[PDB]
């Protein structure tokens, strides 16, 4: 057994505290502006604020480690490595409306998000814990609501991936052509509906949230706020978006959801589920993009997991939704649509 | 706007999966932590067993284990760690099979479980600050105190044990290659851990009296290594007389000035004729996604957020701290994966 390699597991943690290093010390955008080039780690730090002499060399440990691990490009010239955008790291950067992954992977690294994953094994030890809970002392979404460092980093993470979905979204669903009105029920800082609006003028977009994160929110015209608890009731709503809420419930609560989104609902009125769907698993970006939410959702959440189809239609079966259709868009992200049935 | 253009259909949406990074390592503790790699071993190696079958042996009696063990697992399974079948069962890897202990009871788990501790990682939240700062360490800055000394006040078993089932599994490599022990009659190891460096080489070479220098606070957990004594101190005042040094993964934890001085006086200790042997992992020049750029790359990212100007150095980076320090010759013994014994002669 070559145990001596085996040691080198221990690169599995470098690995993605080497990579928010980069991302905290802008790195992919200090290339990003040299051109589709190849930047030394000096090069690099003339685009950093700091008066250190040995920033350089100190920026090539953390980066010579993303190069050998593939999400940079590097090659060695006459002035020592020199490092460039691979096809993976390319979503690092902003695009022409500023979104890229960044906000989502300093959110999942996070110390409070990091420090909780330290307790995922009491899932499988113990009945009902949860990790974030037992780590902190409270759920993920009323420490968000006392802890404003938090607050700001999820209410972005979750505004950049609502961009990022649906530009894969509108390339292929086309159900939301002809709505009137859409009620996005924990529709986050409004992203989502501003998204849609953006694509379908004509449809009104009410934002029904937690008051933490309304008052963190932009000012979207066309959007509407209104604060609500989902569990208690969902305003009247002629269609109803849920888009990464589902998740981050367990079977019960989920239900409960879906029954408020019917009870909402008039006759022919639906809902929409944006979600990532387990594949039937493997190396690929179909079964990362669902277990690595489905891990996040472990240590973060009141029994949220992610699902399959068959299990996405069993919840909107048990909550008054006979009619479904699923509709795959990416790389295991769906649309769904629980239907109201008209007379 | 054709600059801009560039990141116009992007796939930001599985760059979305880069949250996998930080999502595997725990996952990996989590494993570890329930003996996950054990159960599965205890099968037969290539045989695979179901969450269910793998929880009947975790005490626990938590109706939900099976399914909750099968999300940490399908993760490990994904990303090569294990092997998966499908509910799910899973066995091991060539790359989890050294997380089972050997014979003597000698795995990879101690360092892994050190590396991703708590305190380890939260230092790394600070390791951009070394870029900005001039002479800041993350763990001094996350911390408040130096590693050595934190581990003095207390993890010092963490490390203590960490370094002891790796110093296990790099001599078990270095003596199917090394042979500059077996002629020696004493060995005195600077900073040599709780011994079992010594252990292993008295073990394989009897007539070798071991002398651990160290820390008070790591002699404290030194078991009884037949052959092996202890004695505390501290090396930067000066090392024990000696015939011969040890100095293993000590150096690279240290900047150039300091690691002079630990040779300077470790010459001071020794006689006209006496010897250092100094076990490293060494850095390529050119690096890329191999085992030997691994394996200097992972501590050189760990000495540059847990030590005091520590770093991984080429053989020419060696070479030219032995003849700062007064050493005029230096050979060098490629042991394996970039694994190197090196001897610098006074
Ligand atoms: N009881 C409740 N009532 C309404 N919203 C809730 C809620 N509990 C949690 N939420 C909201 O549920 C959201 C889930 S995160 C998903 C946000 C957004 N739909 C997106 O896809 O980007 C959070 O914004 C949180 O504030
Ligand atoms: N001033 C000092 N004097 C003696 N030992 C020291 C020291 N500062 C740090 N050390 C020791 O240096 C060691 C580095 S870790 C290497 C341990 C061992 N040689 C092995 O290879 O497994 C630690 O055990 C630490 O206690
Ligand atoms: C190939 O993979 C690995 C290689 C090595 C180590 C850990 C690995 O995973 C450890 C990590 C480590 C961390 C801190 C130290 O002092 C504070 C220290 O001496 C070491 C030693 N090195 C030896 C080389
Ligand atoms: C493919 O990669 C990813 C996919 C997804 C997420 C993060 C990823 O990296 C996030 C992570 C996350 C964490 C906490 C949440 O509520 C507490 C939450 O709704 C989500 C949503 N999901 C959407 C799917």
Redesign the pocket.
Known sequence: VNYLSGLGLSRLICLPMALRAAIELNVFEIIFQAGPAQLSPAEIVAKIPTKNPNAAIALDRILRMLGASSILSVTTMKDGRVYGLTEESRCLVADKNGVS?VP??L??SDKA?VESFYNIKDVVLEEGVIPFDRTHGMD??AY?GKEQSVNKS?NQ??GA?STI?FDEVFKVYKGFHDLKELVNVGGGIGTSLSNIIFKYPHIKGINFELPHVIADAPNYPGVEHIAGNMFEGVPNAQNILLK??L??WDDERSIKILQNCWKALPEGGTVIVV??VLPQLGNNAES???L??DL??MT??PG?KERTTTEFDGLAKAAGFAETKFFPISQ?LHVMEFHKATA
């Open positions: 992954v989502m992977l959110f999942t998000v993920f979404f968000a999820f993470a979750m991936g979905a990464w809420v998740h981050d979600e990532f990362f993009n669902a690595t939410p996040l959702m973060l959440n949220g295991g």
